[PDB]
């Protein structure tokens, strides 16, 4: 019994009068000195060792890519050298299975650098790092490079859709004579700096050839650039984004789910809220920020039903629906609910 109703705030509260390992779908968190499990939004966080200096792996090949499964944060680097992707016949090492590269779709952060020098020819993007959001750069490759992509002759677009911060390090993107979409990137927003000789981009595909073929940024992207074609591959959106995809608008007045804006991002609103036609439906995602309740109202919150037996600090709480669907308290000297405020309206 962890939750207890409150007469003052009209909602549930943590009950003050309420080892084992957490399940694989829950992470062990600490709420002010109280160990408890908490569900993970999809995959649970898991730290994994990296590649390069400091680790026993020089490149990511066939013998180590299976250890990168369910990894959400590399505590190191990721090196994709030529001998790790195309094998090495002088040692009878087979080439890396390209479909094994999809294990990095769970990677959301890299502590050190990202060194990509070889990629399967049938993969025109690094979309296997679509969930990569932050490159730390605590350890750097070569001359202070935190991101290095050289001589990948079959990469059309980068594909780092969610990458929005590179804390430190220089950037090298060269010798990719078929790469586009990267010319209009606003690296000042990603690098958190002034890009003072921190960009080494050259000898790719010329801007004149990418623009003439219509392979530029989507009109829904803003001036911040785009990691490829489509409304999803934008860095920032011109107006609003729904689920990481740039859209023309949210659903303030019409739509399958009524939405509200928060920092130019569309979030669906609380289900206990009446969808309003032509007018706004909600301020935020809470049940107390809505325009009109979908059913009933218990104080500030819109509820589906009035508290009919919920435990409180003094006992069971019983409330009756008012004439206008407001959850008002039943009479004190009454048990098992009531119909109205009067005494005989009980039981």
């Amino acid at each position, epitope marked *: 019994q962890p939750l207890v109703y409150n007469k003052l705030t009209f909602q549930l509260e943590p009950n003050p009068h309420t080892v084992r390992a957490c399940p694989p779908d829950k992470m062990e968190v600490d709420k002010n000195g109280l160990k408890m499990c908490e569900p993970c939004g999809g995959l649970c966080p898991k730290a994994c060792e990296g590649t390069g200096s400091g680790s026993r792996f020089q490149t990511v090949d066939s013998s180590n890519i299976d250890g990168f499964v369910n990894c959400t944060k590399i505590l190191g680097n990721l090196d994709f050298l030529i001998t790790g992707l195309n094998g090495d016949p002088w040692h009878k090492i087979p080439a890396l299975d390209p479909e094994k590269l999809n294990v990095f779709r769970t990677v959301r952060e890299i502590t050190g650098y990202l060194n990509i020098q070889s990629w399967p020819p049938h993969m025109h993007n690094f979309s296997v790092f679509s969930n990569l959001t932050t490159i730390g750069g605590r350890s*750097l490759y*070569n*001359r*202070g490079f935190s991101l290095l992509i*050289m001589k990948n002759l079959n990469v059309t677009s980068l594909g780092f859709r969610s990458l929005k911060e590179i804390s430190a390090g220089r950037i090298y993107i060269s010798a990719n004579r078929q790469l586009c979409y990267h010319h209009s990137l606003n690296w000042t927003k990603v690098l958190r700096g002034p890009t003072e*000789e921190r960009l080494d981009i050259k000898h790719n595909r010329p801007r004149r050839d990418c623009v003439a073929e219509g392979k530029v940024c989507d009109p829904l992207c803003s001036s911040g650039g785009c990691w490829g074609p489509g409304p999803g591959q934008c860095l920032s959106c011109r107006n609003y984004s729904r689920g990481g995809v740039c859209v023309t608008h949210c659903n303030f007045l019409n739509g399958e789910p009524r939405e509200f804006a928060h920092e130019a991002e569309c979030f669906s609103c609380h289900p206990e809220c009446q969808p309003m036609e032509g007018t706004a439906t909600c301020n935020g995602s809470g049940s107390d920020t809505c325009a009109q309740c979908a059913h009933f109202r218990d104080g500030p919150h819109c509820v589906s039903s009035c508290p009919h037996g919920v435990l409180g600090a003094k006992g069971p709480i019983y409330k009756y629906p008012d004439v206008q669907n407001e959850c008002r308290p039943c009479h004190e000297n009454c048990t098992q609910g009531c119909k109205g405020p009067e005494l005989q309206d009980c039981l």
Partner: antibody
Amino acid sequence: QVQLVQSGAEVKKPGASVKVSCKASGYTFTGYYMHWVRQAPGQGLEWMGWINPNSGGTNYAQKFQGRVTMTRDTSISTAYMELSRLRSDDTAVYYCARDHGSRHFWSYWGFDYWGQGTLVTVSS
Amino acid sequence: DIQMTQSPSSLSASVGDRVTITCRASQSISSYLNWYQQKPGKAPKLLIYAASSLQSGVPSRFSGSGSGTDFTLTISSLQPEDFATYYCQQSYSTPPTFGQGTKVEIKR
């Protein structure tokens, strides 16, 4: 063994031009970049620029950019530096050094072999 | 331009002493720093490259260390052939910058 031979000493007047050679022998001439470093009498070192002896590409320092022309002659394995628009403060000993790396992007720009040094005195 | 700052400028030490010269970078240069020895009137000789790696031929008493900003060229037991001027070179940025140079002198 590896050995870099430069031209003799030169004496120039302010405004003329000097072209110092660097004859290489003992290694694949087109396999390692050629750096040029000068040293004023009783002073430190000063890097002027390198030249790719395979492609002919150059990379001059900003101070000298516009009045230094580094060329190559792979038929005789010789590198040349022509520093025109001479001044009094250009009086130094011009060395030619060779990058210790065949793959330049991963090189550390360490000068493992130098020339004997060419003194160029520029005064009115 | 990443200016190198060597310390000390001059140094008086005798044969057998352990000397230590320091090369400080104005900004972080990772591990791209070399060391050189210049005899009077001779061209510089490469001692240590890549901060710590010892060039082939140089004796094992020459050793380098450090990364980022502070680097150090340490040689143990000075030898008569080791009395010269020592420069540090950075190769991180496009114009290689040298230090002012330390000049070890014979104590007397």
